[PDB]
């Protein structure tokens, strides 16, 4: 495979041959799901415990002052990318003295992770962010990707076997743009509760969620605070 010395090369059909393989490298990562309402967007993540027991490698991250993220791929590379995103979001707090809008945020990181895809001997940022925030208009949510091609989506799921969570979540878009926080996050957890290997429970340990929107800071619900979100039997 002479296309192994390879973020400079092209496969002869159209393929760049490893920054879609970084998309494989975030298919391998842990599953998560974010979505948006008409008022406030939510993020929900299950956290893998590949150890004795842990904080299970805490996924959703505080970047911001209402522009929160959800990583899924490499963790050190994710932390590098959110120190970038974090630092220049605070730089837009410093200079312009307004909240940095979510679209320009995700676009300029979409131009920051695009440079090592271009040049030589530098791997792409193999992490699939699932960023979500509430700017002036409705609470946006952006999947971006290691191929530096973000998506202004609503209700996206990325991670391990997250396609089933999408196909639950695709056929339940009609009860979005309504459906307040108490009945919205239930509707996201029963979207997350399909990526699990078919044995019964979204426990309080592994599920960490985040809420952002109108008149509330991006708020992280850890091991304790996810316990008021409880329902569903399947």
């Amino acid at each position: 495979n002479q296309y192994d010395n390879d973020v400079t090369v092209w496969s002869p059909q159209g393929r760049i041959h490893q920054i879609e393989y970084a998309m494989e490298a975030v298919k391998q990562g842990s599953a998560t799901v974010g979505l948006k309402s008409k008022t406030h967007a939510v993020l929900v993540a299950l956290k893998r415990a590949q150890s004795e027991l842990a904080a299970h490698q805490k996924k959703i991250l505080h970047v911001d002052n209402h522009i929160g993220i959800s990583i899924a791929g490499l963790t050190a590379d994710a932390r590098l990318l959110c120190n970038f995103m974090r630092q220049e979001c605070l730089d837009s707090r410093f200079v312009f003295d307004r909240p940095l809008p979510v679209s320009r945020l995700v676009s300029l990181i979409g131009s920051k992770t695009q440079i090592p895809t271009q040049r030589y001997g530098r791997r792409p940022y193999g992490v699939g962010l699932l960023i979500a925030g509430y700017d002036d208009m409705g609470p946006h949510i952006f999947q971006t990707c290691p191929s530096a091609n973000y998506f202004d989506c609503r209700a996206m799921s990325i991670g391990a076997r997250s396609q089933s969570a999408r196909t639950y979540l695709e056929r339940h878009m009609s009860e979005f743009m309504e459906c307040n926080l108490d009945e919205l996050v239930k509707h996201g957890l029963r979207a997350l509760r399909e990526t699990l290997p078919a044995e019964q429970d979204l426990t309080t340990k592994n599920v960490s969620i985040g809420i952002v929107g109108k008149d509330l800071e991006f708020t992280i619900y850890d091991d304790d605070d996810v316990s008021p979100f409880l329902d569903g039997l399947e």
């Binding site: 200079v95 312009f96 003295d97 307004r98 700017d135 002036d136 208009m137």
Partner: protein, 216 residues
């Protein structure tokens, strides 16, 4: 500092129920020489914000091309999100403090104003970076002369209609025609309202020299 820079004198402004009106004379005074008469010192930016200049005019052309380029650049991202006059004031503040912090300072001293989503705005940005908000502003010797007429009426009633504010800054601009030496007759008056930025230039001052013939 090194040369007779081309200056202005004063951009005085007041906010009102409705929007905010700022006014300045068109003058390019080359150090006691009115070298440039028809010279606009009132910048229009995006439709809810305005901008003046009192000091050096060359630095105001530098600021009109960087403000202009910045506001068209973030204007063409689509997604709404124009600059509230929060951000022009704060960016201009950090530009000037980061400019005197390297001792290569911008020498002009402007006031930017604009009507945001809810209410109006009238902020001062100084040569040194001394930036604040006020119900009524004036720059240069207007800050000595137009400023008493502005913070007399606004201490009585802090609510103005558009004609009262417009006649107020026309009268203050007449006072700066009377007392300020670096002041010229015609002036642009310029108002931003709910319908946007509009600039009504140039105007004149009805002079009252009737006290002249009592001197012996």
């Amino acid at each position: 500092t090194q040369n007779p820079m081309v200056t202005g004198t004063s951009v005085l402004g007041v906010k009102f129920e409705g929007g905010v009106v700022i006014a300045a004379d068109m003058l390019g005074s080359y150090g006691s020489l009115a070298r440039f008469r028809n010279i606009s010192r009132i910048m229009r930016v995006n439709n809810s914000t305005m901008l003046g200049a009192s000091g050096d005019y060359a630095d105001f052309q530098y600021l009109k091309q960087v403000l202009g380029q910045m506001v068209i650049d973030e204007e063409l991202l689509g997604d709404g999100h124009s600059y509230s006059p929060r951000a022009i004031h704060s960016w201009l503040t950090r530009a000037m403090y980061s400019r005197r912090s390297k001792m290569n300072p911008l020498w002009n001293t402007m006031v930017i104003g604009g009507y945001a989503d809810g209410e109006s705005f009238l902020g001062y940005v100084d040569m040194l970076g001394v930036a604040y908000e006020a119900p009524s502003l004036a720059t240069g010797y207007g800050a000595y002369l137009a400023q008493p007429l502005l913070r007399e009426v606004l201490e009585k009633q802090p609510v103005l209609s558009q004609t009262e504010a417009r006649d107020l800054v026309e009268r203050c601009m007449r006072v700066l025609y009377y007392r300020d030496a670096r002041s010229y007759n015609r002036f642009q008056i310029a108002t931003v309202t709910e319908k946007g930025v509009e600039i009504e230039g140039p105007l004149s001052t009805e002079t009252n020299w009737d006290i002249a013939h009592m001197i012996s």
